Amino acid sequence: TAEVMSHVTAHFGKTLEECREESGLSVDILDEFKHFWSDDFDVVHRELGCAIICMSNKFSLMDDDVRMHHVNMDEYIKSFPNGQVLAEKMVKLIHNCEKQFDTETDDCTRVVKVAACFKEDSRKEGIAPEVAMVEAVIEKY
Ligand SMILES: CCCCC/C=C\C=C\CCCCCCCO
Ligand SMILES: [Mg+2]
Ligand SMILES: [Mg+2]
Ligand SMILES: [Mg+2]
What we know:
Order of helices and strands: HHHHHHH
Number of strands: 0
Subunit structure: Homodimer.
Keywords: Disulfide bond, Olfaction, Sensory transduction, Signal, Transport
Family: Belongs to the PBP/GOBP family.
Bound molecules: (8E,10Z)-hexadeca-8,10-dien-1-ol, magnesium ion
InterPro entries: Odorant/phero-bd_Lep (IPR006072), PBP/GOBP (IPR006170), PBP_GOBP_sf (IPR036728)
Function: Present in the aqueous fluid surrounding olfactory sensory dendrites and are thought to aid in the capture and transport of hydrophobic odorants into and through this fluid.
């Protein structure tokens, strides 16, 4: 659900600032991670793929093939209030998007394509949160 997705986003997003230098993700590309969910943000830059890699690796959320670690992602989602209702669905969506971009050889570009797929399928499945919702949860943990 959208509230669980806003807790995952708010928490995950905390690692954005420490990942900027190494990914090249200028503040003019993405200022706050929460804006990932805006209608006016295009999830397209290779730099943001590189940043998502950096962020993920902080929480062990990707495996050594630079794809989602399913078990660690399940446990991470379940660590939020009401996480059990999202954990299976979100792992399924990400992994279906992963399958669509398996032929992309550049890991950064691949990850940003997967992320744009995941945003669109989240919107489609009615689990994409509003930016206001992520902001409402930003001070937690
Ligand atoms: C992965 C943490 C989830 C945070 C939710 C909001 C936005 C981020 C979506 C990241 C897309 C999934 C990246 C890993 C799949 C690429 O192989
Ligand atoms: Mg770099
Ligand atoms: Mg709107
Ligand atoms: Mg690792």
